[PDB]
């Protein structure tokens, strides 16, 4: 009884993120598929513990 804007054979997707590792074959307005495990964008700087 669920509804979605993006569907894959394994399940549906609700996401604002412009990518997924889930399944190559999709139907809808969907984020782009890749084979990556992790995709992580550095925004801030390195963490140096205050010493």
């Amino acid at each position: 009884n669920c509804e979605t804007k993006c569907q894959t054979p394994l399940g549906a997707i609700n996401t604002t993120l412009p990518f997924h590792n889930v399944h190559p074959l999709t139907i809808g307005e969907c984020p782009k598929y890749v084979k990556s495990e992790k995709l992580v964008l550095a925004t801030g700087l390195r963490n140096v513990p205050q010493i």
Partner: protein
């Protein structure tokens, strides 16, 4: 880092500044506390947002693979379809992971440059009226109170005005 500010002399960072990314705190007998730079932080923030909006939107168009079925006398065509779609997935995956890695490293060193540059910007201002401690802090050859601390911040600390008091005040 690459510009040597972070895990260089500054050696660590201050949990006590929530005001933005980088900045100062001072010891005035008048008063002491953490205040962070408006202009530099603003600039860096803008640049970063531009970097993420630049990447995430550099795949707007990008390969999307939908469906297909072939007979058992179509085997070559099937294998070709597979090799192509797989090939492109591989390609865009590489493109993505790599771009992320680069933009990451470049981002961190970017922050470094920001810091070191802010520092050098202060130094080239106050230079001979103060001792550089080498720890990323400036010890005074006179008193800059706070209004004038904030004049250091705003970028004009009025050098020659405070020149003499420190000129004799130093040596010893």
């Amino acid at each position: 880092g690459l510009f040597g500010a972070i895990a260089g002399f500054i050696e660590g960072g201050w949990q006590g500044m929530v005001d933005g990314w980088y900045g100062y705190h001072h010891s005035n007998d008048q008063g002491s506390g953490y205040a962070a730079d408006k202009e530099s932080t603003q600039k860096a923030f803008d640049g970063i947002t531009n970097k993420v909006n630049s990447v995430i939107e550099k795949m707007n168009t990008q390969f999307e693979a939908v469906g297909k079925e072939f007979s058992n006398l179509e085997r070559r065509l099937e294998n070709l379809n597979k090799k192509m779609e797989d090939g492109f997935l591989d390609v865009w995956t590489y493109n993505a992971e790599l771009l992320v890695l680069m933009e990451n490293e470049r981002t961190l060193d970017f922050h470094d440059s920001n810091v070191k540059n802010l520092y050098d910007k202060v130094r080239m201002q106050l230079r001979d009226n103060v001792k550089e401690l080498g720890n990323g802090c400036f010890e005074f050859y006179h008193k800059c109170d706070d209004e004038c601390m904030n004049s250091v911040k705003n970028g004009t600390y009025d050098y020659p005005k405070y020149e003499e008091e420190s000129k004799l005040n130093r040596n010893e």
